Design a protein around this ligand. Structure first.
Ligand SMILES: C[C@H](NC(=O)CCC(=O)c1cccs1)c1cccnc1
Length: 330
């Protein structure tokens, strides 16, 4: 089997991407944030504290003839940005782009933190990291991909995120029309439960490539590119007036600037992130200070190849017995 679904930016800055997902019988369609950095499929629901719901579409398990309470199961997750959610668990039928998994754990939120409430466009998360990170207790549950994998034509999914435009998540096949040149594959460590890999280096604009190993995660659920402070300083040094602002919480730059590109290495191959991809717009409405799309990972503890990086590539998440990651230009 295969599936193919369009993923759409939630706003004009590509702050995140949402993908429609069918849950239950009859189908209830929710727009979920596909997140290769976590492993819980959780949704706003009829059980979510009323004051914490503000415009989201909810899953109502009592209206699904295929929903079953997973008795005694609870979940609770906290992400790197300090956001969180928790609740109980149902199993139900879940379909993405024509690919159906029966008995998928659908984690129903009883509580969500303020940033989730405040984002009316995201109805939940669909985790695509390794199932070892799943938070359901006392019986850990599998991700949608982990459940689908054996049925797929090939045990892979691909992320093809757009810049200020829709893109595609495919399951079970590689669309050879969706990228240019060849796909370069690189090793993955699953030891921390992430799609963790090692970039071979970077360049800023038309500058020379610096060969250096940068270990990080391929994370569709993080907006920006978070890299070591040395690398980030080398980038922003090429932008007149750019500076790290403790009050704003990262590098800002004059909105009048033309940003240089940023290149990262995948083996001997190179992925080029155009300068425009690194502009996240005014820090507040009407400001001439703009927020940067490349930020230091120093406070985080891991480097993160988030959407800013991934959207410059066609990315293969290869779930073979020994997982790997593939990157192509597009
Ligand atoms: C934006 C956030 N990203 C992460 O949590 C990346 C992961 C991260 O920071 C860390 C991993 C290990 C130590 S720190 C997010 C929010 C909501 C849903 N998904 C992701």
């Amino acid at each position: 089997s295969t599936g193919s679904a369009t993923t759409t930016p939630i706003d004009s800055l590509d702050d995140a991407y949402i993908t429609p997902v069918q849950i239950g019988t009859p189908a209830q369609t929710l727009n979920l944030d596909f997140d290769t950095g976590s492993s819980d499929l959780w949704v706003f629901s009829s059980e979510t504290t009323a004051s914490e719901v503000d415009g989201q579409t909810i899953y109502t398990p009592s209206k699904s003839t295929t929903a079953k309470l997973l008795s005694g199961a609870t979940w609770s997750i906290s992400y790197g940005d300090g956001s969180s959610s928790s609740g109980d668990v149902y199993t139900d039928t879940v379909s993405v782009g024509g690919l159906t998994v029966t008995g998928q754990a659908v984690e129903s939120a009883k509580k969500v933190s303020s940033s989730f409430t405040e984002d009316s466009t995201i109805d939940g998360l669909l985790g695509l990291a390794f199932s070892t990170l799943n938070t359901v207790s006392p019986t850990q549950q599998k991700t949608f991909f982990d459940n689908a994998k054996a049925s797929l034509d090939s045990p892979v999914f691909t992320a093809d995120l757009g810049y200020h435009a829709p893109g595609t998540y495919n399951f079970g096949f590689i669309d050879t029309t969706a990228y240019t040149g060849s796909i370069t594959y690189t090793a993955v460590s699953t030891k921390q439960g992430f799609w963790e890999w090692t970039s071979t280096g970077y360049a800023v604009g038309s500058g020379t490539f610096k060969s250096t190993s940068i270990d990080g995660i391929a994370d569709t659920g993080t907006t920006l590119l978070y890299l070591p402070a040395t690398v980030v300083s080398a980038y922003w040094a090429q932008v007149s007036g750019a500076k790290s602002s403790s009050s704003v919480g990262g590098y800002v730059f004059p909105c009048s600037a033309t940003l240089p590109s940023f290149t990262f290495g995948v083996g001997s191959a190179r992925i080029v992130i155009p300068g425009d991809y690194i502009d996240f717009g005014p820090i507040s409405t009407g400001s001439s200070s703009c927020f940067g799309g490349i930020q230091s990972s120093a406070g985080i503890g891991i480097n993160i190849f988030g959407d800013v990086a991934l959207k410059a590539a066609f990315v293969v998440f290869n779930g073979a017995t020994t997982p790997t990651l593939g990157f192509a230009s597009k």
